[PDB]
């Protein structure tokens, strides 16, 4: 009668030759093997964004664009006024390494470096530009750029910071300032205090003020170590240091 149980356990071992713990172990082994076999050797490049000028003198060095394998290289062309100057026609040497995605009416260019260590060159005629503008490109560099802005010498056919402060961007040339008892931030940029809050100041006045819909305020003012703030009908005094 134990022959049936022996047949059951032998049949179970023949049907499943592995323990479940062995199954999960080899699954982790497969995950590690996949991770190593599709790991990327070498130091990866740093993704960046660049803006340069186009030198149209007859003795300048042409600009070189750093590329990556299978990654987007987007170029945006502007004039000296910064206005978008769209692209009429273009040409690329050796497209076996580089694919071009070009909207008909745009200055936007999308390049993918298909070959590993082969570098190329390109020329572009704009809609009003007399002299065509050319670039040289090389993939596999230590830094890679996502958006490359190119400001040209010629005029195109087409031609404050407090809004971005109210959005949340601090102005440059500043340092963080510690305050006591204040749900606000202050920045000194060019001997002018920019303070972002949601409160209302009373005593020293402001040069300018900008308020948002959700209740945030931005104040531009001179130097003042002391502030009086009216919140919910009551006045609170606070101090700040330069």
């Amino acid at each position: 009668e134990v022959i049936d149980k022996k047949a059951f356990k032998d049949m179970t071992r023949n049907l499943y030759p592995l323990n479940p713990e062995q199954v999960v172990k080899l699954k982790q082994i497969y995950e590690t093997s996949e991770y190593a076999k599709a790991a990327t050797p070498g130091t990866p490049p740093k993704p960046t964004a660049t803006s340069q000028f186009v030198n149209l003198s007859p003795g300048s060095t042409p600009p070189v664009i750093r590329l990556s394998q299978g990654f987007v290289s987007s170029l945006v062309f502007l004039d000296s006024t910064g206005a978008p100057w769209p692209i009429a026609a273009y040409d690329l040497g050796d497209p076996s390494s580089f694919n071009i995605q070009w909207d008909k009416t745009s200055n936007t260019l999308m390049i993918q470096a298909t070959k590993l260590y082969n570098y190329g060159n390109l020329a572009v005629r704009l809609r009003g530009l007399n002299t065509p503008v050319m670039l040289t490109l090389i993939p596999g560099q230590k830094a890679v750029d996502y958006r490359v802005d190119l400001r040209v010498q010629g005029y195109g056919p087409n031609a404050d910071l407090l809004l971005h402060v109210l959005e949340g961007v601090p102005p440059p040339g500043s340092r963080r300032l510690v305050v006591s008892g204040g749900d606000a931030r202050a920045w000194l940029s060019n001997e002018k205090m920019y303070v972002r809050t949601n409160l209302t100041i009373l005593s020293p006045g402001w040069l300018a003020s900008m308020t948002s819909a959700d209740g945030t305020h931005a104040y531009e003012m001179q130097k003042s170590p002391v502030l009086l703030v009216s919140w919910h009908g009551k006045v609170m005094q606070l101090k700040v240091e330069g």
């Binding site: 022959i3 049936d4 022996k6 047949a7 059951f8 032998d10 049949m11 023949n14 049907l15």
Partner: protein, 34 residues
Amino acid sequence: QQEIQQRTSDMLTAATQLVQDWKQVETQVYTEGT
């Protein structure tokens, strides 16, 4: 003592038959009416 394997063999495909029956799953029938 060779009778174990013929005891082992026949229930193997018998167990393999019914172990497929826990695998099937049918989509439900959904409709409207007016």
